[PDB]
Amino acid sequence: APLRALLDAQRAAFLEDGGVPDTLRQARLQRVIDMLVEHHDALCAAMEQDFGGRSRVFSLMNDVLGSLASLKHARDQLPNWTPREPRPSVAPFDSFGATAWVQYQPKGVVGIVGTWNAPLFTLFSPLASVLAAGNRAVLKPSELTPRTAEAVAQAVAAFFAPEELAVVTGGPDVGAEFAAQPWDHLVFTGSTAVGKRVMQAAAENLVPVTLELGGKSPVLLSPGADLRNAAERIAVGKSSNSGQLCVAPDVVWVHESQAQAFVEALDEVWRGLFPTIAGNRDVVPVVNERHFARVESYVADAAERGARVLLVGGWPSAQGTAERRMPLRVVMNPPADSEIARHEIFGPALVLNTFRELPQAVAAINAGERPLALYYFGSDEAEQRWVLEHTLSGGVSINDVCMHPALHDAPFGGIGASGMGRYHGREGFLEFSHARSVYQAGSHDPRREWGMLPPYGEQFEAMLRASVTR
């Protein structure tokens, strides 16, 4: 009842809104920016405590500045997106004055369900597109970052009336009720398995959904790639948030003859990034004991099944285990029925699979679900093109990892099991708009003269038949 009452109040205000001018959308976006600028110290502290020691430097980059960048881009660019677009109209009536256009209008009240790994970005980066399109919104921060959820709730209550932007906090019971409301559009970031249940819940009210989901993002290492450079970039991206990123490298494909050299370079880079693991505040802990036991169970299962497990970047210790801070474990060619071959790792472990011929790796990728991200390292344009043409992933980075979601003017989203829909840029503006085609009649209707109206003319029928051509 209280959640529905909030949706109804936003909807009542929207139906009185009518048109939502550019400058009102920009003012709303500016208000969100001003709120984050005012509250970012409290927000970084909350994120740190929620993880049990997540670096405020990483939070500032990933969640605070990442969100601010999305919001500013939408603020500054949306005047280019709102104008209507004239289109050719229906021939031959356009020869008599008929015209046409597409106009974009907000859908109304959008719900946004965030996740815990980037608990501001997964709320405020989709919000930037949602507000640019002229909607009102309700945010549901993750209960796995409850200090952050509460700081976001207090901050929005201080800056916004609830009819314009509101926050709902609570456990997964609240989230479930959230997903069942008749929104005009629902955005969800989270696991593939939960995304299915979100879509089932949305189906009850025909709510369109943006689902940003998961998978095992592969890296393809060209047999001709600079292995030392690839190891550096992959180490930086994989160690970010201790692998707790939706686009983190999950499986690396490397030529058999280059596996050892790659792991050695990966280890050297990682030890230079993290000279200690236990007690190192730069190492992001696994968010909680549940997810720590999850990741560790994949590693232990792989070892029991006979896969070789390598330590990269340090040694485990009692204290690191207690802090949920770990070096990278690399699992070589795990069996297809092992847990780590079948689940998203989302943590400090990595699968390293070897190949003889790069099409062998592409075939394995294609036999699995389509990942949110796919990566290719190399310098052979023909090979790069072949890999992309014969795969499908949500997005791609070439000669780096984890970079394409930071593109403001390109869509960010999945495909297949990694999700549907997108946000960011003009594509994200379109996602939360209805594209409304309009035909406008001309002055003179020639149908009656031409015999096109019943009782139908024989000449008209003759002309219809002469129009059936290749």
Place this chain on the structure above:
Amino acid sequence: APLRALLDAQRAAFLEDGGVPDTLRQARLQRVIDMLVEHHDALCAAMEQDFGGRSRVFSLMNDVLGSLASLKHARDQLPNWTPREPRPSVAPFDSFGATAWVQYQPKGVVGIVGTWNAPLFTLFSPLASVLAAGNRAVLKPSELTPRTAEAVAQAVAAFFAPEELAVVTGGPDVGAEFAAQPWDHLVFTGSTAVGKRVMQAAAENLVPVTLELGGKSPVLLSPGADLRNAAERIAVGKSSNSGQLCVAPDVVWVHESQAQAFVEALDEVWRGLFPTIAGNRDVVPVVNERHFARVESYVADAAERGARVLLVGGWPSAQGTAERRMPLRVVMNPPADSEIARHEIFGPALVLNTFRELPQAVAAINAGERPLALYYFGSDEAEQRWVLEHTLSGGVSINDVCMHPALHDAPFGGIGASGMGRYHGREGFLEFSHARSVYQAGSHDPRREWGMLPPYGEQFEAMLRASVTR
């Protein structure tokens, strides 16, 4: 299994296509064009007999030429849609050579479920966009047009290998198995209630959907509108297919003082279009006795509840009833709990609601579900703008009805209960494509030398804080 075996055969062949060049997509579209050109007379005969007398002129114009025009537009225009689109890359790394683009790739195997009221158009017009995007497809014609379904199946089997394009026929049991398959995309046209169940079925496999559904499409008659011109255009569009169109005018809103003039004009026009009703091959029958009883019960139920019912365009007769050919019945101001106020008519009856101030009509529209189409007649540009700004519908026609789905270069689809997603034009190409964002790294990575890598120093932190600005 047979249905799944066919999907798997198409999927296996898709994975071997790799890239799908423009010219292959054009050849596929041309083969569909050639098939329809070769078989259109037999298809029009099947459609006539399935309805018990649907005009071969109407079928030729709407199902045959409508489908052909969509396919030829996709064939001729797709080389404009497939090129990759460069985009600004991620700052500051674009100052170091990083680049980006969006590339479009087919999703794979698309299922298309058609309906009976336009049994070719609702298969082949979405198919045009599906094939333009590089996909393979399976079609499910409506079983309410069984001769047409069979003719489509035989025509496709004569012209196409089933791994490229195939047809499945059968009743609701087949339709349910069809909606449960793991397509890469599913297109469904039909009622809102069945669309809900389709979306529920798709959720189990995270299948993205294009749902083209229903509602009660309203006409707003400005008090300044030319009433005779509006009556003429509305009579023509409402009598098309005897109202069995997803964008047919369903409710007309008229100022109280103009209702009589409008109904008199509508009658005069309708009698000119159909001087007789019974035995008149120009009058499309209601497709079968079930839908005939449905439509007639809405009329009866409204009169039983006190609503005035007016005859437009002729007088009912025993012969007309047996043929399922009727004059228009106009139901005035029916109560909100009447069947005709709550259901899509989709036949030869129309609700006429009166207003004293035009905003009353908009308010009532906004209190119901969002319709697939909305129409405005008038000459006041400001009033026209106000109406469109304060309503939302799939599409719109101004000073005509039923025209905007014939736009080749604008999307066609619904919003809210009238559906989600779209086809036609570049928008339809994009519907059945994945838009894959790609970041490509530059030569020199500046992060290390700028202190952006762990171990995190205080100067990097200071630079981050200095970036937190309005």
